[PDB]
Amino acid sequence: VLSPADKTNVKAAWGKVGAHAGEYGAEALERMFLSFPTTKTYFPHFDLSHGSAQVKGHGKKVADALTNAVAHVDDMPNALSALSDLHAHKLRVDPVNFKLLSHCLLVTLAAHLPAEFTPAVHASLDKFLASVSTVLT
Amino acid sequence: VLSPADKTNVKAAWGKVGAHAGEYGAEALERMFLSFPTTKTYFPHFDLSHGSAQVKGHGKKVADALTNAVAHVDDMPNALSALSDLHAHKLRVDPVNFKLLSHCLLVTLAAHLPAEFTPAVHASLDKFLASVSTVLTSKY
Amino acid sequence: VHLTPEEKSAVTALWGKVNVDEVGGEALGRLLVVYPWTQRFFESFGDLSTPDAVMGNPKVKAHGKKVLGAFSDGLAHLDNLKGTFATLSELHCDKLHVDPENFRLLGNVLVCVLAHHFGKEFTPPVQAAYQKVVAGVANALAHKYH
Amino acid sequence: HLTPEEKSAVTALWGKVNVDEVGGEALGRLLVVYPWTQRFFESFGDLSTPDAVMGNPKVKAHGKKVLGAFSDGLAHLDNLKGTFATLSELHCDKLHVDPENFRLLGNVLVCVLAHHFGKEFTPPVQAAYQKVVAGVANALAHKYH
Amino acid sequence: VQLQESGGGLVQPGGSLRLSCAASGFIFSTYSMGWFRQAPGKEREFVAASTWGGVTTNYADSVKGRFTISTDNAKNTVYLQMNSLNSGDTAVYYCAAARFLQNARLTTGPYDYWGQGTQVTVSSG
Amino acid sequence: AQVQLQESGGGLVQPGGSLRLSCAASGFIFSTYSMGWFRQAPGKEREFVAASTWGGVTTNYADSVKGRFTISTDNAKNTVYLQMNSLNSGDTAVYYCAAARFLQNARLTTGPYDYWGQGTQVTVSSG
Ligand code: HEM
Ligand code: HEM
Ligand code: HEM
Ligand code: HEM
């Protein structure tokens, strides 16, 4: 359950991503694939090499889904319903993997948006990413 | 996030608890303290011995909070607001302990209400207990 | 892992009352129903789309037999679980890449099944002994992770 | 464990880290981001707000010790279980810290490194560091498994 | 709403037999299946039962090692394998069902549904 | 109101000698600024010496001063220090303190800085 301060922190911090959605999403995925190779079993038909167009395209899709979730932070189960069935029913993604991607997303935001990654905003982002993960599972 | 069918399963199964609320809550606690002794560190001034009246009292309070959550399963954050602040803010309960208490609750329901513990209801109760735990481990 | 009389003996007592064949199917079936992501490891098993389908699946029933047979063998080496499961640890960790939290979930599902069929007989103290065993088993399976 | 080019990247980045200060930041962030971990530190005083946590001098001082042990781990990457044998007993047999918290602290440290090093903290560099913090968490949990 | 028992009949001392109970009218997966018997002039009298699905076993000590239980969940039928029968086993064997009857309590547990029972008579003549 | 970066320490030293510079900062949230040291010799371009990220968490030394100079911070005093050892004639210069909000480690050598001090003379010579 996100607090009012969490929502304000996430909206302010994530809104700085803007046009970098694809770059940040692709980088978070590349970080995950390298740091936690087991996550690669969910993308068996992908070219997972650095800069692969498939990772770029998918990274944009993930970041764009988070922007949407931020815009609907008060009704995320509704806004992410189709994504929930994809990940929980079709893909059968083990919940531990959402913690890995969420961590790699924080890492990417910390590297790219140093001014935004204060301890309190760090905490709110983490809770936001965990809330998104709860819904998608 | 609970489905409409989950809500139906939990209401039907938990509504059969009835007058056993205190007993079932106390047994789940006694099961947790015995199987997972580290959980006792959160009750440092309690009499935790077998059959303790204090554990019975707390067991009813825990069982009564779940009845309330079932009745307000569509608005758990609002209905659990005070308990959320208690567990997350006051007590600083490590989230792993909610998984232990949830497991011991399932064991208690399975031992006492076999007809209610079908695989499908098993799945819903687990999710319900996880949703309650998520709320009780939150700060809002 | 270390038990005691009425703990090592209490586990052995209740297990002598368990049909090793069938209990595996029930515990594995319930794992696949309650935690559906685990179904990903058994797609080759056929229909796992329904609780009824899961529990009637002969591949689940058959694979459960093997899972609990190794568990039963673990009960004969309670003081050497890491050695008894060393090869299975290699299979689950190095080849299948089952996250170790799933090992804990299966032990707790088995405990729930034992409680379901035994009622009052599965007392808090008896459960405590069984929680020691399934934690020992889950740990030994995860040994190739440590 | 670590390839030659991973050990070389890890040591390079660590030479640029102020072990004292990085420890206070990471421990502070752990207590802010996962507030239940504050329960293990009752005796450290005021941890009632993020500002209080990040200004707390017992946190700063204890962070130095935590990061000193990480630094010690980097010099004994092939025997972390032995280097951390005392800390494992303390954290597992005396403090009963759930081992998932060891993982969280390692990941918070990775977040701090990315925060301060930016682009230099590349995906491959982070991956080497994830192996290190996973080894440390596993060595710390050894008395559990 | 039918419990049809089959198997049983006449056997020589030392022989074996397999009894079956065909279930209908309920969700078989939710019923504890048990076997009772009553000898002529004797009271009705527990032999063996299993938890639903046969996960755990509990037999009267006079039949343990001697009788063994079944599961056939697809056919909604349970079977009772009887070995080393002695002409002291003669009785009508009754199939009985109780929804979610837990172990150890099978011997002293109210049952919901009862069949005809099937004659098993062991004698040397 | 005004942001100040005041450099002190420094003066004259013999080759091989040591000197400690300090830079007292005021007018910004010190915990969020990376503090750096530059130097400029007469007629020459200004050139990076050493810096740390905000709070002093990470450091960055010019290769010519690494192991030789040590940078430190005192977050309670909003002050950064530069300990200079093994000084040589090539170290004579005006040394500038500089501050940059949330500037990460690799960019310390070039990354735009927000505030600059006046600089303080450091003279190394055998005469
Ligand atoms: C915040 C967490 C996550 C978000 C927001 C997210 C979002 C998305 C989105 C937007 C899609 C594409 C849907 C479409 O193309 O219509 C997708 C697909 C997918 N996701 Fe995720 N996801 C998350 C976590 C994960 C994790 C942890 C994994 C596995 C480790 C994963 C694996 C996949 C796979 C395999 C696909 C299918 C890709 C394809 O068909 O091209 N996702 N997800
Ligand atoms: C379903 C999960 C849980 C429920 C429904 C629940 C419910 C409750 C309720 C109703 C109270 C009474 C609070 C009051 O009187 O104001 C309480 C207090 C408390 N709970 Fe929980 N709780 C849960 C999980 C846990 C867990 C896992 C722990 C520790 C392992 C825990 C530790 C405590 C403690 C220490 C108190 C205060 C007792 C006292 O000092 O009197 N709770 N909880
Ligand atoms: C925790 C206790 C467990 C025990 C004692 C156990 C036991 C076994 C054994 C003995 C085998 C060998 C089967 C063979 O060689 O064909 C096996 C195979 C396997 N295990 Fe487990 N297992 C456990 C947990 C798990 C879990 C939690 C999962 C996944 C959720 C899993 C996934 C598998 C898979 C996919 C196979 C291969 C099955 C096949 O395709 O034939 N195991 N297990
Ligand atoms: C994961 C890497 C960790 C390392 C390398 C580490 C290291 C240390 C060290 C060096 C000490 C000092 C012991 C002494 O001076 O005798 C210590 C103490 C302690 N650690 Fe950790 N620690 C880690 C994680 C954690 C976590 C996650 C927690 C709890 C969430 C924790 C809780 C404590 C506590 C409560 C103490 C005692 C502090 C006191 O009261 O003086 N540690 N640890």
mmCIF file of C-alpha atoms in Angstrom, chain D:
data_model
loop_
_atom_site.group_PDB
_atom_site.id
_atom_site.type_symbol
_atom_site.label_atom_id
_atom_site.label_comp_id
_atom_site.label_asym_id
_atom_site.label_seq_id
_atom_site.Cartn_x
_atom_site.Cartn_y
_atom_site.Cartn_z
ATOM 1 C CA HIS D 1 33.609 -16.988 -8.962
ATOM 2 C CA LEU D 2 35.014 -13.869 -10.655
ATOM 3 C CA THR D 3 36.757 -13.801 -14.009
ATOM 4 C CA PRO D 4 40.085 -11.956 -14.221
ATOM 5 C CA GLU D 5 38.334 -9.028 -15.912
ATOM 6 C CA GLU D 6 35.718 -8.977 -13.132
ATOM 7 C CA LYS D 7 38.198 -9.052 -10.271
ATOM 8 C CA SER D 8 40.094 -6.260 -12.021
ATOM 9 C CA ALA D 9 36.947 -4.165 -12.464
ATOM 10 C CA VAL D 10 35.831 -4.758 -8.875
ATOM 11 C CA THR D 11 39.180 -3.753 -7.366
ATOM 12 C CA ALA D 12 39.350 -0.689 -9.613
ATOM 13 C CA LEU D 13 35.974 0.650 -8.506
ATOM 14 C CA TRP D 14 36.664 -0.188 -4.859
ATOM 15 C CA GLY D 15 39.865 1.889 -4.908
ATOM 16 C CA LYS D 16 37.582 4.892 -5.521
ATOM 17 C CA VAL D 17 35.233 4.157 -2.609
ATOM 18 C CA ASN D 18 35.527 5.855 0.779
ATOM 19 C CA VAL D 19 34.817 2.723 2.819
ATOM 20 C CA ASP D 20 33.933 4.741 5.922
ATOM 21 C CA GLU D 21 31.369 6.993 4.235
ATOM 22 C CA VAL D 22 29.880 4.425 1.841
ATOM 23 C CA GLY D 23 29.030 2.238 4.835
ATOM 24 C CA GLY D 24 27.004 4.904 6.621
ATOM 25 C CA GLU D 25 25.120 5.748 3.437
ATOM 26 C CA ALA D 26 24.246 2.122 2.634
ATOM 27 C CA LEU D 27 23.247 1.172 6.188
ATOM 28 C CA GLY D 28 21.242 4.381 6.496
ATOM 29 C CA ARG D 29 19.493 3.638 3.209
ATOM 30 C CA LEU D 30 18.729 0.075 4.333
ATOM 31 C CA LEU D 31 17.002 1.400 7.461
ATOM 32 C CA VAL D 32 15.049 3.968 5.453
ATOM 33 C CA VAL D 33 14.073 1.764 2.510
ATOM 34 C CA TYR D 34 13.185 -1.344 4.621
ATOM 35 C CA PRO D 35 12.089 0.086 7.976
ATOM 36 C CA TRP D 36 11.638 -3.252 9.736
ATOM 37 C CA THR D 37 15.444 -3.569 9.785
ATOM 38 C CA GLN D 38 15.476 -0.724 12.322
ATOM 39 C CA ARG D 39 14.173 -3.218 14.882
ATOM 40 C CA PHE D 40 17.614 -4.846 15.048
ATOM 41 C CA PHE D 41 19.145 -1.479 16.014
ATOM 42 C CA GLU D 42 16.925 -0.284 18.889
ATOM 43 C CA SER D 43 19.978 0.835 20.856
ATOM 44 C CA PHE D 44 21.149 3.206 18.102
ATOM 45 C CA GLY D 45 18.692 5.914 19.160
ATOM 46 C CA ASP D 46 16.482 8.096 16.974
ATOM 47 C CA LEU D 47 15.489 6.342 13.721
ATOM 48 C CA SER D 48 12.018 7.902 13.457
ATOM 49 C CA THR D 49 12.437 9.696 10.105
ATOM 50 C CA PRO D 50 14.736 9.388 7.071
ATOM 51 C CA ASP D 51 16.548 12.569 8.146
ATOM 52 C CA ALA D 52 16.972 11.156 11.662
ATOM 53 C CA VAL D 53 18.319 7.863 10.285
ATOM 54 C CA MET D 54 20.744 9.522 7.867
ATOM 55 C CA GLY D 55 22.009 11.840 10.619
ATOM 56 C CA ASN D 56 22.241 9.163 13.310
ATOM 57 C CA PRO D 57 25.886 8.837 14.477
ATOM 58 C CA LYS D 58 25.549 5.227 15.653
ATOM 59 C CA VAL D 59 24.344 4.310 12.165
ATOM 60 C CA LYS D 60 27.320 6.119 10.617
ATOM 61 C CA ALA D 61 29.740 4.381 12.978
ATOM 62 C CA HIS D 62 28.238 0.916 12.581
ATOM 63 C CA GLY D 63 28.165 1.389 8.799
ATOM 64 C CA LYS D 64 31.950 1.781 8.831
ATOM 65 C CA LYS D 65 32.218 -1.633 10.500
ATOM 66 C CA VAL D 66 29.800 -3.275 8.058
ATOM 67 C CA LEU D 67 31.698 -1.933 5.057
ATOM 68 C CA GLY D 68 35.038 -2.831 6.612
ATOM 69 C CA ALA D 69 33.880 -6.460 6.603
ATOM 70 C CA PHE D 70 32.764 -6.182 2.963
ATOM 71 C CA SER D 71 36.232 -4.849 2.171
ATOM 72 C CA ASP D 72 37.673 -7.834 4.051
ATOM 73 C CA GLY D 73 35.488 -10.099 1.931
ATOM 74 C CA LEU D 74 37.009 -8.631 -1.229
ATOM 75 C CA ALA D 75 40.459 -9.803 -0.104
ATOM 76 C CA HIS D 76 39.260 -13.389 0.570
ATOM 77 C CA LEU D 77 36.807 -14.062 -2.253
ATOM 78 C CA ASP D 78 37.665 -17.780 -2.284
ATOM 79 C CA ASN D 79 37.013 -18.332 1.445
ATOM 80 C CA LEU D 80 34.172 -16.020 2.403
ATOM 81 C CA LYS D 81 32.528 -18.656 4.585
ATOM 82 C CA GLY D 82 35.709 -18.798 6.666
ATOM 83 C CA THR D 83 36.293 -15.047 6.795
ATOM 84 C CA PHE D 84 32.702 -14.482 7.987
ATOM 85 C CA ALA D 85 32.505 -17.423 10.404
ATOM 86 C CA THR D 86 32.177 -15.162 13.449
ATOM 87 C CA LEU D 87 29.731 -12.732 11.830
ATOM 88 C CA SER D 88 27.606 -15.669 10.660
ATOM 89 C CA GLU D 89 27.296 -17.035 14.187
ATOM 90 C CA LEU D 90 26.391 -13.552 15.416
ATOM 91 C CA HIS D 91 23.816 -12.732 12.729
ATOM 92 C CA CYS D 92 22.257 -16.201 12.538
ATOM 93 C CA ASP D 93 22.644 -17.884 15.934
ATOM 94 C CA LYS D 94 22.410 -14.783 18.166
ATOM 95 C CA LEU D 95 20.578 -12.023 16.260
ATOM 96 C CA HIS D 96 18.358 -14.259 14.098
ATOM 97 C CA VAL D 97 18.458 -11.897 11.129
ATOM 98 C CA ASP D 98 16.363 -13.388 8.359
ATOM 99 C CA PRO D 99 18.844 -14.078 5.527
ATOM 100 C CA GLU D 100 16.762 -12.186 2.964
ATOM 101 C CA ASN D 101 17.905 -9.034 4.774
ATOM 102 C CA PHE D 102 21.522 -9.892 3.885
ATOM 103 C CA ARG D 103 20.460 -9.825 0.230
ATOM 104 C CA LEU D 104 18.698 -6.474 0.693
ATOM 105 C CA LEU D 105 21.777 -4.836 2.232
ATOM 106 C CA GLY D 106 24.013 -6.082 -0.569
ATOM 107 C CA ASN D 107 21.566 -4.664 -3.109
ATOM 108 C CA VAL D 108 21.325 -1.316 -1.328
ATOM 109 C CA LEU D 109 25.123 -1.075 -1.497
ATOM 110 C CA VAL D 110 24.931 -1.762 -5.239
ATOM 111 C CA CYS D 111 22.390 1.069 -5.474
ATOM 112 C CA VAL D 112 24.771 3.435 -3.669
ATOM 113 C CA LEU D 113 27.633 2.495 -6.002
ATOM 114 C CA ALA D 114 25.437 3.144 -9.046
ATOM 115 C CA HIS D 115 24.301 6.417 -7.474
ATOM 116 C CA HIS D 116 27.831 7.791 -7.081
ATOM 117 C CA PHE D 117 29.544 6.234 -10.136
ATOM 118 C CA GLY D 118 26.799 6.699 -12.740
ATOM 119 C CA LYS D 119 27.695 5.557 -16.238
ATOM 120 C CA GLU D 120 30.944 4.062 -14.911
ATOM 121 C CA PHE D 121 28.854 1.484 -12.977
ATOM 122 C CA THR D 122 28.192 -0.480 -16.151
ATOM 123 C CA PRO D 123 25.972 -3.564 -16.479
ATOM 124 C CA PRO D 124 29.056 -5.821 -16.502
ATOM 125 C CA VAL D 125 30.564 -3.971 -13.534
ATOM 126 C CA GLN D 126 27.318 -4.297 -11.579
ATOM 127 C CA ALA D 127 27.203 -8.002 -12.466
ATOM 128 C CA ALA D 128 30.617 -8.596 -10.889
ATOM 129 C CA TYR D 129 29.443 -6.741 -7.788
ATOM 130 C CA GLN D 130 26.251 -8.841 -7.631
ATOM 131 C CA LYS D 131 28.432 -11.968 -7.449
ATOM 132 C CA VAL D 132 30.379 -10.424 -4.563
ATOM 133 C CA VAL D 133 27.369 -9.334 -2.511
ATOM 134 C CA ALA D 134 25.712 -12.704 -3.159
ATOM 135 C CA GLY D 135 28.831 -14.467 -1.901
ATOM 136 C CA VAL D 136 28.862 -12.270 1.206
ATOM 137 C CA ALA D 137 25.166 -12.827 1.941
ATOM 138 C CA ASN D 138 25.648 -16.583 1.499
ATOM 139 C CA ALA D 139 28.689 -16.608 3.782
ATOM 140 C CA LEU D 140 26.721 -14.608 6.357
ATOM 141 C CA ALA D 141 23.821 -17.097 6.208
ATOM 142 C CA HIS D 142 26.164 -20.112 6.404
ATOM 143 C CA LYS D 143 25.199 -21.033 9.972
ATOM 144 C CA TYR D 144 21.642 -21.384 8.577
ATOM 145 C CA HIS D 145 22.568 -23.792 5.780
#
